[PDB]
Amino acid sequence: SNRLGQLVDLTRLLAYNYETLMACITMNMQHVQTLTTEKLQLTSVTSLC
Amino acid sequence: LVSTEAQIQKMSQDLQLEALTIQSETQFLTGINSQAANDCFKTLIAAMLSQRTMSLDFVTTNYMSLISGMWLLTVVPNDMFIRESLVACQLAIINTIIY
Amino acid sequence: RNLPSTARYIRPNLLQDRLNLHDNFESLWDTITTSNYILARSVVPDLKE
Amino acid sequence: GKYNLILSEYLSFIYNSQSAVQIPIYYSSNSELENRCIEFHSKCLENSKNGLSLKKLFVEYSDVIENATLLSILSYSYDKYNAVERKLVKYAKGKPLEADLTVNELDYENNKITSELFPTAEEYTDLLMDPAILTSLSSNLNAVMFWLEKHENDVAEKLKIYKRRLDLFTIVASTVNKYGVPRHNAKYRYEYEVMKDKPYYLVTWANSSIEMLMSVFSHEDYLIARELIVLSYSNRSTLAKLVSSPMSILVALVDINGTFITNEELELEFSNKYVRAIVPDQTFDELKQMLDNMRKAGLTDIPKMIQDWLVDCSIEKFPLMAKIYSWSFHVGFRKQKMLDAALDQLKTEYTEDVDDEMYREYTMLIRDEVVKMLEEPVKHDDHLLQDSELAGLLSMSSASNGESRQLKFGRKTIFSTKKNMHVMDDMANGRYTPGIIPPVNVDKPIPLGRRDVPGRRTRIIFILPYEYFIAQHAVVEKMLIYAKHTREYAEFYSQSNQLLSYGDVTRFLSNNSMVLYTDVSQWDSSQHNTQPFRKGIIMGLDMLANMTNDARVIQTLNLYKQTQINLMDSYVQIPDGNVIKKIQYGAVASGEKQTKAANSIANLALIKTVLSRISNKYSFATKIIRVDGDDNYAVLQFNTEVTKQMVQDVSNDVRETYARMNTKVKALVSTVGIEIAKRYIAGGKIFFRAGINLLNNEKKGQSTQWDQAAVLYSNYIVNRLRGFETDREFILTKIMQMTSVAITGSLRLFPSERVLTTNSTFKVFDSEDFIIEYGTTDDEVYIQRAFMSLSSQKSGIADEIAASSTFKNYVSRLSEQLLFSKNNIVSRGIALTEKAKLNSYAPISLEKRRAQISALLTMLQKPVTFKSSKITINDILRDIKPFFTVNEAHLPIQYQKFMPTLPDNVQYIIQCIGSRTYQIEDDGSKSAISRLISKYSVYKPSIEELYKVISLHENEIQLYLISLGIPKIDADTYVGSKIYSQDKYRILESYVYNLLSINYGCYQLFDFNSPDLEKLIRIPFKGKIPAVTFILHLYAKLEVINHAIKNGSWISLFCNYPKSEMIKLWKKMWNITSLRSPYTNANFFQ
Amino acid sequence: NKEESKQLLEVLKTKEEHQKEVQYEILQ
Amino acid sequence: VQYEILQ
């Protein structure tokens, strides 16, 4: 909770990078539930936060 | 990035996992390095860009991971995760922290 | 994982005991109960602290 | 009851000349029979003096040879020259071995002729080959040939054993006879003159081969022994490592079907848990490479055995793998030059390309651990940190050896390496400056000792000035106090005194768990033991300095910090011919006070950092982390069942993460077992390597041939318990060879069985394996009293040192540091205590030992005409024996077998009464007096001294405590509290347990509090005499256990001891005058 | 001679008693 | 006694 400013900055940075790189996508961003997923460690989320 | 020694010191002083642990077990902070932070940033943005489903791997006893997963679910759309992983993370948060 | 729509499995035949070996097959039932006891011992967690 | 017959036959064998005479001496407690014994001995001496046969005397005094007890045999031989070679030529019929001089990387490690390695006598040194044992190769050959002669006409499997050993000894004897048996000197050293034209490693190889061939019983034994004996003639460097390598993988190939789980330091709770062994293909490739390396070295039978076992990977046939592992260590030591061994140790590739983040976190963790260890004592002004210098002075006896310095005491000159004597000398000459830590840099580089273990690489040891120990002692003692209650520190963790000798790794082994284990014995000069480690400790000390207001604690911390700063920039000395190499070495090594605990701290921090990085790619909970000396192991638990890919990925990630910090690690990941230096677990079972070498030693000891025979028997017992059985007859032959003393060049005295197996300072072995010796007959009590009379001896060196002005000045300075001023009574007690602490000096202890042995020899040459009222343990047991009735009983097998390599009878005991639960310490550690002593000094008074003290007057106890270094207020508190009244019972318990070896040999593995055992003992309780009840119950337990050990069956004991008998024995229970040689202590764990 | 070790290694890699479940490979 | 210094 005490990292509120850093987390706001991180969210804005992540969203901006997503939008900027999404501007470069030329094929439809179709959302499907894929057979295999990309595993994400919540400890990596803790590291980023 | 924040100096990892400083952040580990802060989080260890506040969490005090050593005192909570049973004398026969070992508990300490894990996965608080810069490599993990960079991997998380890349994984989140790349998964959202490619619309590839993500799965959540966590240890329920590590409530720090759940607290960070709260932010993850806040910022990352819930449909970017396989239903089972989202349900597991949310149920861990509910039954370990909130309720 | 999201299992594909073309995935298959075989259900085990979990019908309850039709021979009723618990009734009048005392030696066979003793063997069965001994096996169950050994398995239960194998899976019972070990006390700690 | 076979030792005397074997001794007589051996004397006939080795002295087969017609002029050889054996004169048997006897003794008796009965005066009527003792008179006949004396007359018989006198007549035998007279007949030998006149050269007359003694056969008729055996008829005249046939009662003495029947009713009296043999005391010794006097042998007169006059044809000893060239006897062993005359016997050996018979067995040299085979083809002698020819060494392959292109097998070892270093030229001098190839078994070539000595002249080829040392052209001149001045260049020669036996240090690279010295067996370092006070027994000759000629004696080993004589023992083997005596065994062959004795068992020449055996039948059945005995004949097969004889044939196998005959083939192996044919190899050895042909090889030795090709060059002739080298002759040792009085010091049992092999000179250049007798070694010029022989292979350099002939003697040590022959000793190892004799041990191996006398350890052969089965066909598999024979194959292993033949392979190793033939290969070790040429291979002197890599053979043991080659053979022991596969085990580290084999433990990971056996599934667990039930296992043990450590609870507290020896207590096991058993699980029926089933765990499958998950092995990736890379591990199988590594095992294939290991077998290929075996075959490239000329091995055929051992790799074939391993391949055959690999068909099923079953725990039932794993004993053969354990056998190969144990046998690998018996190919001897590798005593390479100090230069090569050191250069191998300090072969470093330091880089600036390391992960800065990881190193900073590791340094921070070291700082945090130091602060955690030392916060409370530093914050609360602990007395030890206030009196750190005094604590170090009092504990100097526990310090490592320094470098030899020329000391003078009075008019005598000595060359002690003991740091306490160095402190004395420096005090006398105004050079005692604890406040100054001498530098260890290029100006004063550190001398190096070496620790050598078979198979393992040599380790370097710092030899530091005593100021380092003085500065570090109290801080490290606080660190050990903290580490004793921290489970992570496997080396130190213990509730009272005993370590988790079985380890704690099998509790969390599961199908969702994997155990990562790593050998860290080679991390002495690693980059993480450089500046980061020392500076982490320094930062911890800097933090601790702000937590205290006492100037003395701050000075202690400053001195410790200065030691660390100096050791950061240190050099080491290594001789090389006529040039001393000064090599920069700012890394860690043993020989420093903090080395063990500091290494544990650093390893814990490093593994925490590595696991933190490994969590990036996998989700797991770290169940336990253990840092046990030369090994580390951590158990990781996953949310899924462990797969091959998971194991391989975790291993690779651990290796790469360690490499990120420049640490070279072979990270071994298993699911079912680990392999560390001091044990290995396979299939839920625990194994200890049985590699103690018998006829070879790491370095020359400071003991006598008598004590070395005792140590030889102790090592044989430990090896037997661990699954490496050497023939007991060979061991007894060595015992009789080593305990014999030359009265003259023609007369030699051989002690009898009663002398050697009696509980005393002279004890060497036991008549029965694994059974403590005691006896209720009059002769045994008589001889025990006689031997006790000889225990007390003085040392001239100790007397001269204690009378010197140097020692008196040291005592005065110690007293003034202890807050006594010309007390005249306290000072004398302190002087006595310091003179006792001088016993660690090898000349003093050797002088006392030789005085004792000489007195024993004078007694043994005559029938024992000694009588005393002194009470020994045999007296107590004789008093209580007549009131015990024995019946046949039965115990079912109801306990698991967790040590498959235990001997069948010991295993039977364990299966019937169970394994030890908790241990009563043998030194009275958990008594109030012992805890009070430990509060100020790490010096441990012997339990016999405490037993004597606790029954003295109050003022005598107070004076003794003050002499030990306890302040007068605390000693007076202890005495006025009358705590000694309760303490005497704990002291008596420890004293008796020490006398009867309850915590040594196989007894340490047994549960003496077992409900099954006490179900066999029926002693009706009579209260208010706890000592008598205690001794009765312990005696009953020993009788039952020993009967089961010898016979494999069970007896119930019943003793309705009369109250009058109890009251009579109560007086004697506090006046026991008994000793047992510490050299007979067979520690199953080591 | 070395072919015996080759067969041993291949059998060990494909041994029944050392293999773990293989569902994920089936899906992949 | 000659010395060799290895840094």
Q: Give the 3-state secondary structure of D753-806.
A: HHHHHCCCCCCCCCCCCCCCCCCCCHHHHHHHHHHHHCCCCCCHHHHHHHHCHH
A44 touches chain D (CB under 8 A): yes
| Spatial distance between the Cα atoms of D1037 and B16, rounded to a whole number of angstroms | 49
Residue D116 in tokens: 């080829």
Residues in A closer than 8 angstroms to E27, CB to CB, are 35-36
Residue C11 in tokens: 């259900």
| Spatial distance between the Cα atoms of D994 and D997, rounded to a whole number of angstroms | 5
Buried b (16+ CB within 10 A) or exposed e, D298-313: ebebbbebbbebbeeb
* Interchain contact D/F (3 or more Cβ pairs less than 8 Å): yes
Residues in E closer than 8 angstroms to C1, CB to CB, are 24, 27
Among D285, D274, D257, which residue's Cα sits nearest to residue D648? D285
| Spatial distance between the Cα atoms of D363 and B10, rounded to a whole number of angstroms | 16
Q: How far does chain F reach from its first CA to its final CA, in angstroms?
A: 19
Q: What does each C-alpha distance from E18 to D156, D251, D307, D739, E21 come to in angstroms?
A: 41, 13, 16, 54, 10
Residue numbers after which chain B breaks, C to N beyond 2.5 angstroms: none
**Nearest chain B residue to C47, by CA:** B24
Q: Is B74 exposed, middle or buried (0-12, 13-18, 19+ CB in 10 A)?
A: exposed
Residue carrying structure tokens 């000893």? D80
Among D205, D183, D191, D244, which residue's Cα sits nearest to residue D110? D205
Residue carrying structure tokens 């605990």? D597
Q: Is D783 exposed, middle or buried (0-12, 13-18, 19+ CB in 10 A)?
A: buried
Sheet holding D685-687, edge to edge: D675-676, D679-682, D685-687
**Nearest chain C residue to B22, by CA:** C49
| Spatial distance between the Cα atoms of D801 and E5, rounded to a whole number of angstroms | 68
E27 touches chain C (CB under 8 A): yes
| Spatial distance between the Cα atoms of D611 and D609, rounded to a whole number of angstroms | 6
E7 touches chain D (CB under 8 A): no
D755, D860 contact by CB (below 8 A): yes
Among E12, C48, E11, E24, which residue's Cα sits nearest to residue D277? E12
CA atoms within a 13 Å half-sphere pointing along the CA-CB vector of D1075: 20
The Cβ of residue D1086 has, within 10 Å, a number of other Cβ atoms equal to 11
Q: Is D1061 exposed, middle or buried (0-12, 13-18, 19+ CB in 10 A)?
A: middle
| Spatial distance between the Cα atoms of D366 and D165, rounded to a whole number of angstroms | 55
Measured at the alpha carbon of residue D370, what is the angle toward residues D364 and D374, in degrees to the nearest 5? Answer: 145
Interface of A with C in 3-32 (CB under 8 A): none
D441, D570 contact by CB (below 8 A): yes
Which phi and psi angles does C19 have, rounded to 5°? -80, -15
Q: Residues near D73 by Cβ (< 8 Å), separated by ≥ 6?
A: D7, D8, D11, D22, D23, D24, D25, D749, D750, D752
Q: How far does chain C reach from its first CA to its final CA, in angstroms?
A: 38
| Spatial distance between the Cα atoms of D879 and D48, rounded to a whole number of angstroms | 41
Dihedral sign for Cα A16, A22, A23, A29, please.
negative
Do E17 and D281 count as a contact with CB atoms less than 8 A apart? no
Dihedral sign for Cα D127, D129, D132, D135, please.
negative
Q: Residues near D1046 by Cβ (< 8 Å), separated by ≥ 6?
A: D768, D771, D905
* Interchain contact E/F (3 or more Cβ pairs less than 8 Å): no
The beta-carbon contacts of D884-887 under 8 Å, at least 24 apart in sequence, are D884/D1035, D884/D1036, D884/D1039, D884/D1053, D884/D1054, D884/D1055, D885/D1053, D885/D1054, D885/D1055, D886/D1039, D886/D1051, D886/D1052, D886/D1053, D887/D1051, D887/D1052, D887/D1053, D887/D1054
Strand-pair category, A38-41 with B54-57:
parallel
Helices (H) and strands (E) in chain B, counts: 5, 1
E23 touches chain A (CB under 8 A): no
Q: Pick from D608, D618, D620: which is nearest to B28 by CB?
A: D608
| Spatial distance between the Cα atoms of D958 and D970, rounded to a whole number of angstroms | 9
Residues in D closer than 8 angstroms to B59, CB to CB, are 619-621, 639
Residues in D closer than 8 angstroms to E12, CB to CB, are 279, 284, 287, 310
Q: What does each C-alpha distance from D530 to D523, D597, F7 come to in angstroms?
A: 11, 16, 15
The Cβ of residue D850 has, within 10 Å, a number of other Cβ atoms equal to 14
Residue of E2, E4, E20, E28 to mutate, interface with D, max D Cβ within 10 Å = E20
Residue carrying structure tokens 């009378």? D803
Residues in C closer than 8 angstroms to E24, CB to CB, are 1
| Spatial distance between the Cα atoms of D717 and D739, rounded to a whole number of angstroms | 18
Q: Is D665 exposed, middle or buried (0-12, 13-18, 19+ CB in 10 A)?
A: buried
Residue carrying structure tokens 């604590």? D391
| Spatial distance between the Cα atoms of D458 and D341, rounded to a whole number of angstroms | 6
Residues in E closer than 8 angstroms to A36, CB to CB, are 27-28
Beta bridge partners of D21: D76
Q: Residues near D1086 by Cβ (< 8 Å), separated by ≥ 6?
A: D678, D692, D718
Full set of structural domains in chain D with CATH: 1-82+697-765+1074-1082 (no CATH), 83-235 (1.20.120.1390), 236-253+279-336 (1.10.10.1990), 254-278+490-519+595-696 (3.30.70.2480), 337-396+438-489+520-594 (1.10.357.80), 397-437+766-867 (no CATH), 868-920+1007-1073 (3.30.230.140), 921-1006 (1.20.120.1400)
Residue by residue, DSSP assigns B34-68 as HHHHHHHHHHHHHHHHHT--EEEE--TT-HHHHHH
| Spatial distance between the Cα atoms of D568 and D562, rounded to a whole number of angstroms | 10
The Cβ of residue A15 has, within 10 Å, a number of other Cβ atoms equal to 13
Residue D783 in tokens: 């001889």
Amino acid at site C12 = P
Residue D897 in tokens: 């077998």
C41 touches chain D (CB under 8 A): yes
| Spatial distance between the Cα atoms of D740 and D25, rounded to a whole number of angstroms | 14
Beta bridge partners of D536: none
In total, the C-beta contacts within 8 angstroms joining chain B to chain D are 64
Resolution in A: 2.7
Residues in D closer than 8 angstroms to C43, CB to CB, are 273
Q: Residues near B35 by Cβ (< 8 Å), separated by ≥ 6?
A: A47, D613, D616
The Cβ of residue B24 has, within 10 Å, a number of other Cβ atoms equal to 15
Touching chains, D (3+ CB pairs < 8 A) = A, B, C, E, F
| Spatial distance between the Cα atoms of D448 and D14, rounded to a whole number of angstroms | 44
Touching chains, E (3+ CB pairs < 8 A) = A, C, D
Residues in B closer than 8 angstroms to C48, CB to CB, are 22, 24
| Spatial distance between the Cα atoms of D257 and D271, rounded to a whole number of angstroms | 9
| Spatial distance between the Cα atoms of D385 and D374, rounded to a whole number of angstroms | 10
The Cβ of residue E11 has, within 10 Å, a number of other Cβ atoms equal to 14
Approach to solving: cryo-EM
Q: What does each C-alpha distance from D60 to D54, D66, D116, D611 come to in angstroms?
A: 10, 12, 62, 82
| Spatial distance between the Cα atoms of D956 and D950, rounded to a whole number of angstroms | 9
Q: What does each C-alpha distance from D211 to D131, D142, D172, D208, D730 come to in angstroms?
A: 13, 13, 11, 5, 9
Among D1074, D831, D861, which residue's Cα sits nearest to residue D947? D1074
Q: What does each C-alpha distance from D718 to D743, D1051, D1085 come to in angstroms?
A: 33, 27, 8
Residue B48 in tokens: 């959202």
Strand-pair category, D446-451 with D571-576:
parallel
